[PDB]
Design a protein around this nucleic acid. Sequence first.
RNA 1: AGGAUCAGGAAUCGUCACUCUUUGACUCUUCAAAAGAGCCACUGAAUCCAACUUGGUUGAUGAGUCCCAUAACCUUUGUACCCAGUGAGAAACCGUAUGGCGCGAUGAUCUACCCAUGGGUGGGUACAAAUGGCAGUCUGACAAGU
Length: 50
Amino acid sequence: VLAAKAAVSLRYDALAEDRDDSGDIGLESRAKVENRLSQLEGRDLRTTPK
RNA sequence: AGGAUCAGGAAUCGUCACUCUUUGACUCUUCAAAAGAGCCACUGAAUCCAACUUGGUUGAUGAGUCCCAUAACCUUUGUACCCAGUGAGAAACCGUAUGGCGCGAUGAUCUACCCAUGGGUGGGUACAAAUGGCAGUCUGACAAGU
């Protein structure tokens, strides 16, 4: 997921002539990566009985 | 007089924990099945497809980092050795009545084959090194919740 978003982030940094130089797209990526992480730890592989 | 049945020799503790081993129970469980106190109903849970939802090729899932590609094992090219050690043997006079580096243990002396003690070939052992071998640059479509 990071190695995905790294390609979205690095090419935002290595290939943009106009650039804020301010880390937004990387943070827009990292918010979703953290959200995938927070959805991922939400799941549990155990048995949750009622 | 020596031995074995019914004085020459340690063993009188009102337990606390801890660890270890041991067997037994135990929920199970493979060998591997087979038998089922049987049927209804109520109610609960779980699973699986369909469904729907949310996320996703701006990459969902699957995945032996670490057993080190940071390598192992070689392979070729430049050096250090040995079938460091050997250790007593190497060369034949003397400034103006008298004075010494004239060796040497405190070290003199050397560093499997052919060629008259000049040169090297052959094998083991070690390393440096490889844009050398061995040795050929991941997937990609569902996933997850009810």
